[PDB]
Structure formats: structure tokens, C-alpha cells
Amino acid sequence: ADYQGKNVVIIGLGLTGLSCVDFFLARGVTPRVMDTRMTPPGLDKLPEAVERHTGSLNDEWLMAADLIVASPGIALAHPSLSAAADAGIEIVGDIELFCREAQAPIVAITGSNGKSTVTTLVGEMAKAAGVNVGVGGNIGLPALMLLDDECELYVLELSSFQLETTSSLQAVAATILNVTEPFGLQQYRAAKLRIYENAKVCVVNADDALTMPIRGADERCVSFGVNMGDYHLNHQQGETWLRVKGEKVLNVKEMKLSGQHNYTNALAALALADAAGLPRASSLKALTTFTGLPHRFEVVLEHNGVRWINDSKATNVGSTEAALNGLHVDGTLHLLLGGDGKSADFSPLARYLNGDNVRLYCFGRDGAQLAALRPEVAEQTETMEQAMRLLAPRVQPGDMVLLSPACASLDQFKNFEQRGNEFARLAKELGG
Fold first, then answer.
1. Fewer CB within 10 A of the terminal residue: the chain, N end or C end?
2. Alpha carbon 265 to its chain's center
3. Strand 306-310 vs strand 298-303: parallel, antiparallel, or unpaired?
4. Is 117 annotated as contributing to ligand binding?
5. What residues contact residue 26 under an 8 Å CB cut-off, 6+ apart?
6. Distances from the Cα of 103 to the Cα of 20, 100, 134, 154, angstroms
């Protein structure tokens, strides 16, 4: 698209709005920028020559615009933006600008849960294939920064807010991974369904009807599911396989992530990569080497047959339940639980903690509550570090050390990231 001569106004001075400033300056267009915050992050990164307005939206600037570029977020609901819309002024977001310029195929991923892991995995599948891939769309990697004539494939994580302002996306493969519960379910799902418009292949969740295109499945659709679908899980003879169009393609034991929802993330990623034309061989290889995003079933150490897993992002019971359901451990699971349980009901975890192959190490404010899940195999300490030093002498090849604590960290830690980083530091000391 040609923006020369246009009066361009950008709303938002986060990284996304900054990437929009860079985009227009590179094309000889000087935009104006505004942010309702008095001192947004990006303010001190702006070129001096870009006019800026902070502390409110400047309606005089908006109503005089030829093009408004709105950063995604609750800010899209601002009345000043509605008034501009009411007057017929064109409003787009950064992903719209990107799609107008992209010269390589786009894989587009949205959903309520798992969208970061699946996006990252598809990126790793492309990298294993030797493809010059651009991975982004998350808050920290604005899509416009990825635009490059040498890029061979883009893989984008998209939000509902981003999709609300995007009209030109024509993905080679697109998915809504799942829909669960800022606004009502109904606006939330409508935005997500836009991801399939003009998509060459739609990858749907066979177990979640809200991921199906508005008209339903059509000849563009491939599904992933737990028991059923084009891509699904096959349990037989005590083993579990990824199965694709009726053929076993990978024993899940060759992967480093486990847990059922990580297996379906793997299936969704493989379906996207297949549909984008990436080689099956390298996509499966990437599944065997992927070690996870920070704090999200992250393999922080594998040594002497023991795998140390940082799942500190599990701050509630549902997240730990998902780590445990379908978990694979050859030997003994050493499970670290504890922190501030927020007076939660921990009983859903009980069905997973039976057997001769589970030890619990419980710490933090509510550690005694967690140890009560099964006291005969549980130890209680004040701190995570004490629990780790207690278990380190006991681990043997085949074992897993899993920090999936089902609790908030805030009784002893600044946040779950600090908790996970401390786990990784101590794993390296005690397991190397």
C-alpha cells in the first residue's frame, strides 16, 4: 500500500505503536502518535521529530487523520476512536499494515490457551527445516518488525483485539486452538473467527466447537483432537502415538514435553506446519528437540537420565492438573507443590498421585494442605530450595523433577517467574 502524503495517527506508545512509527518513517511518512498514559513506555524511544501527545487522546489529531492505526487492547473501545469511525475515518491495526505488505506465506494462530507454545513450536519446525522464518505477533515481537524481503514464512500469534482491526489476512494456515472464558464471549469469538477468512487451510480443534468456522467445517478444514480427528492421540499396548490421517507418526516418548495438552499443542503445530508446506521430517524432529517456553513445562536440565521441568506458570489447580494428565515418567515423579493456594480445592489432583512412582515435596504457606493429598509419600519443607535439596540425593535415571506447584508464588517470591528461575538455578547446581 502507498501511504505517501497521508496524515497518519498512531494510538499507543507501547512496542506495537513504536513499530508503526518505524514502519511509516521507513516509507517517508511522519506520523503523529498519542497515548492515554502520561508517560508510556515508548515515549523515550521516539524520534524527536515525531509529534506526540500523552495523557489523553487528542481528538483534533484523530479527526484530521487520513488513517488511524490503533494499538490492540481495551483502548480500541475508546469513544474518540468510535467518533472517528462514525465519521468514516479508516481505522486499522499493525497486523493489517503487515498483511498488506507481506511477501511470504503467513501461519496465523489464535486461541485462549497454548497460543504462545504452538506459535513457538511452529517456528521451531520451520527453523529445523532451514526456513528463514519470522515468528511474532506477541506483545514482545511486533509483526511489523519481522517484515523482510528475505523472509520465507511468517508465523503470527494473534489476539482478538488484533483481529478486530485486520481485514487483509489471507493465511496459508490458520487456527483457533480453543475458546474459553475482558468483554463478552460473543465479541471475543467473532474476532477470532476472522482468522479463517481467506485462509487456505483451517486447522480446527475437534473437541471445541467454538473453533469451527462460522459456517462450519468445509473442504479447507483439518482437525486435531484427543481421541479423534485428522491429528489425534493413539494409546495402545501401553504407549502413546501421534497419529495423522490414520498413521502413527511419532511415539510421544521421543518428545521432551508431556502431558495431554502439550500433546495436543504438538498435534496442532504439526497440522499447521504440514499445511504450510514444511517438511514432515523436520517438523517431527523439532517435536523431539523442543524444550518449552520459560516456566511452561520448560526442560531446564536433562542429565544422568533425570529431567528437571520448570512449570512454575502453573499457579492454580487446573494448570497442574493439565501437567499431570497424560504425564509420562519412566521412573519416579518428584513433584514440587506449594505456595499460596488461594484457598483452592486441591482434590482434583488426587487421582494423579497414586502409584509407587510418585513422591511429593510440599513447601510454602499452604504446604501442609498439599502434603495432605497423600501424606505417606509426602515431605514438607519451608522453602522450595529445601525441598529440592531433600530430593536431589534420591533421584535416579528415569526420574522427573517437576515444579508444577498449583499455587501462587507471592508468599515467598516476587512472581512465578522468579520462582521458576530459582528452580532452574538450583536444578543446575544439584543435578549436574
1. C
2. 10
3. antiparallel
4. yes
5. none
6. 18, 9, 12, 9
Identify the experimental approach: X-ray
CA–CA distance, 144 with 329 (Å, rounded to integer): 42
d(CA 232, CA 430): 37
Tell me the one-letter amino acid at 327.
L
CB 342 within 8 A of CB 328: no
Residue 132 assigned ligand-binding role: no
- Residue 115 marked as a ligand binder: yes
Sign for the CA dihedral angle at 47, 49, 51, 52 comes to positive
3-state secondary structure the chain: CCCCCCCEEEECCCHHHHHHHHHHHHCCCCCEEEECCCCCHHHHHCCCCCCEEECCCCHHHHHCCCEEEECCCHHHHCHHHHHHHHCCCEEECHHHHHHHHCCCCEEEEECCCCHHHHHHHHHHHHHHCCCCEEEECCCCCCHHHHCCCCCCEEEEECCHHHHHCCCCCCCCEEEECCCCCCCCHHHHHHHHHHHHCCCCEEEEECCCHHHCCCCCCCCCEEEECCCCCCEEEEEECCEEEEEECCEEEEEHHHCCCCCHHHHHHHHHHHHHHHHCCCCHHHHHHHHHHCCCECCECEEEEEECCEEEEECCCCCCHHHHHHHHCCCCCCCCEEEEEECECCCCCCHHHHHHCCCCCEEEEEECCCHHHHHCCCHHHEEECCCHHHHHHHHHHHCCCCCEEEECCCCECCCCCCCHHHHHHHHHHHHHHHHC
240 annotated as a binding-site residue: no
127 is in an annotated binding site: no
Structural domains for the chain: 8-91 (3.40.50.720), 97-289 (3.40.1190.10), 298-431 (3.90.190.20)
Alpha-carbon distance of 348 to 166, in angstroms, equals 41
Cβ atoms of residues 333 and 402 within 8 Å:
yes
CA-based nearest residue to 2, from 87, 66, 89: 66
* 283 has binding-site annotation: no
Annotated ligand binding at 113? The verdict is: yes
| The C-alpha cell that represents 290 in the structure block | 523442543
Amino acid at 9: V
Cell numbers linked to 127: 527453523
Structure resolution, Å: 1.6
Q: Which three cell numbers stand for residue 72?
A: 490492540
